[PDB]
């Protein structure tokens, strides 16, 4: 997968970051993708630090991130947010 656009505003509109049902506004400052495209490379915001817990999902009906390619099928929300072992108690 690859991001169609990588502007600061565009990055925050692609995913929703929450913890215990409470979301976080503009949790990122930038975004990118790995060379092989098998993983994302997100730049965090300055309002939190790593403490081994978090969760993340994708915004409903978003089109910024597309699998296959930048012109392939788009991502859709998971049944539940995926786990991230970083910024939250």
SS3 assignment for 15-34:
EEEEECCEEECCCEEEEEEC
Q: What is the dihedral of CA 71, 73, 75, 76, to 10 degrees?
A: 140
State the pairing for strand pair 54-58/82-84: antiparallel
Contacts 24+ apart (CB under 8 A), 69-74: 69/1, 69/2, 70/2, 70/3, 70/4, 72/1
Method used to solve the structure:
cryo-EM
Q: How far apart are CA 21 and CA 34, in angstroms?
A: 29
The two tokens of residue 20 are 């215990």
The runs of H, that is alpha helices, within 1-89 are 8-12
Q: What does the chain come to in residues?
A: 89
The two tokens of residue 68 are 């296959």
Do 17 and 2 contact (CB within 8 A), yes or no?
no
CA of 39: how far to CAs of 36, 46, 73, in Å?
8, 22, 16
Q: How far apart are CA 53 and CA 13, in angstroms?
A: 22
């Amino acid at each position: 997968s690859v991001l169609t656009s990588t502007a600061a505003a565009d990055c925050n509109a692609a995913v929703v970051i929450a913890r215990n049902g409470s979301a976080v506004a503009s949790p990122l400052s930038a975004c990118a993708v790995s060379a092989d495209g098998l993983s994302l490379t997100l730049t965090a915001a300055a309002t939190y630090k790593p403490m081994a817990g978090d969760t993340v999902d994708v915004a409903v009906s978003q089109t910024v991130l597309r699998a296959g390619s930048a012109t392939g099928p788009a991502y859709v929300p998971r049944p539940s947010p995926a786990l991230i072992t970083v910024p939250s108690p």
